């Protein structure tokens, strides 16, 4: 057989379309001011980022060591506005938009763009409408427990920073796309992943699902976790299948 | 209770001398034929003196500690009043609505203001007045 489509997604025509993107959305390099105090920035712009649901905020900070201003690109939280002051650091207040160590915020606070490691500059809860919940602190050997959008519980060090509030851009997925063309335009600014041909619509040379005098898979579509590339298609390492009626 | 009165320090907010600090000389609350609005006659600092330190020489300090003034009639709406006020020794009746009609009297009034402002700068009793506003 030939190299299946999933195996060809290794670069080339499958790279991300990034010309129209203004910059990665990052927290700010963890520095002396944030470790010990706070630093104030002003929201200069709130902008659309092609390929991203959530809007981005360009935030201007004074450089502590040089006569210069540093512009940061943040994931905008809902409620943020241009001209707003945001404060980042250990002593920042618990206000929507501020950036604080998760260990400095009480249990139950709603946060976004949370670091997995202290200083990684934001990993968790970044897509539109998403957030992370503080679940508890363990002061001895400081580790904070958080709930992720997937429902998983994670332990981050109580120095990983987070942004107070929910990512802006609301309930985007509530609107039916309604048309192939709208899906076309959504993925045109993302990557070459649409439209998708079904495996069973192919010939055996193309896909493990291909071939047959009717369109059918043949063997089970739940394939083992340790399948080789080229046979790892369908429902990979599925714990179960079918329409769930009540889950947790 | 009248914010704008002679001797008060105000900030110009519009025009060529925007951001320059001025001292009110006359407060014409009612409008005249020329300037039919609540205007004021003011004297302000067009070029603030430069800071001087102990390491400077005598001649250099003399150069830096100079004031170039201006005199102007300004609408009240182009003034931001402050809380400071100046003493206004001999700038009492020297700048009326008649020195503006003559450039000769204008230069004479400015020279008089320059002497009092400069002498007032030395031995600083109103330091805030001669420091530029940064904006």
């Amino acid at each position: 057989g030939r190299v299946i489509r999933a195996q060809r997604k290794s670069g080339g025509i499958f790279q991300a379309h990034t010309r129209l993107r203004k910059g990665a959305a990052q927290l700010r390099t963890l520095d002396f001011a944030e470790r010990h105090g706070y630093i104030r920035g002003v929201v200069q712009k709130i902008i659309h980022d092609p390929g991203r649901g959530a809007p981005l905020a360009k935030v201007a900070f004074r450089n502590p060591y040089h006569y210069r201003t540093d512009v940061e690109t943040f994931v905008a939280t809902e409620g943020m506005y241009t001209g707003q002051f945001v404060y980042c650091g250990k002593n920042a207040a618990l206000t929507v938009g501020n950036v604080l160590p998760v260990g400095e915020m009480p249990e139950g606070t709603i946060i976004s763009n949370v670091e997995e490691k202290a200083g990684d500059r934001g990993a968790l809860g970044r897509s539109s409408g998403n957030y992370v919940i503080i679940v508890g602190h363990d002061v001895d050997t400081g580790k904070t427990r958080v709930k992720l959008p997937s429902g998983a519980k994670k332990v981050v060090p109580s120095s990983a920073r987070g942004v107070v509030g929910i990512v802006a851009g609301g309930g985007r997925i509530d609107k039916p796309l309604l048309k192939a063309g709208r899906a076309f335009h959504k993925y045109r600014v993302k990557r070459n992943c649409w439209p998708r041909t079904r495996g069973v619509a192919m010939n055996p040379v193309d896909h493990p699902h291909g071939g047959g005098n009717h369109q059918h898979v043949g063997h089970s579509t739940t394939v083992p976790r340790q399948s080789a590339p080229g046979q790892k298609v369908g429902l990979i390492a599925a714990r179960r299948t079918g329409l769930l009626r009540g889950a947790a | 209770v009248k914010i704008l009165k002679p001797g008060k320090v105000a900030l110009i907010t519009r025009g060529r001398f925007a951001g320059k600090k001025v001292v009110i000389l006359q407060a014409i609350d009612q409008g005249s034929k020329s300037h039919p609005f609540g205007h004021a006659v003011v004297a302000g600092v067009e070029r603030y003196p430069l800071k001087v330190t102990k390491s400077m020489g005598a001649k250099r300090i003399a150069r830096r500690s100079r004031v170039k003034p201006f005199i102007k009639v300004v609408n009240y709406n182009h003034l931001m009043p402050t809380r400071y006020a100046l003493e206004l020794d001999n700038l009492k009746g020297l700048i009326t609505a008649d020195t503006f009609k003559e450039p000769t009297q204008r230069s004479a009034a400015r020279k008089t203001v320059k002497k009092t402002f400069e002498e007032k700068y030395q031995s600083g009793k109103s330091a805030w007045f001669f420091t530029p506003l940064r904006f």
Partner: peptide
Amino acid sequence: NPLFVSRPRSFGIGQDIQPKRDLSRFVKW
């Protein structure tokens, strides 16, 4: 003489640009 006025700089977090201190300990050699 009266024009020579002290102009202190605070140097706390977020106040004045830090003075040029010795960074030898943190130099990438």
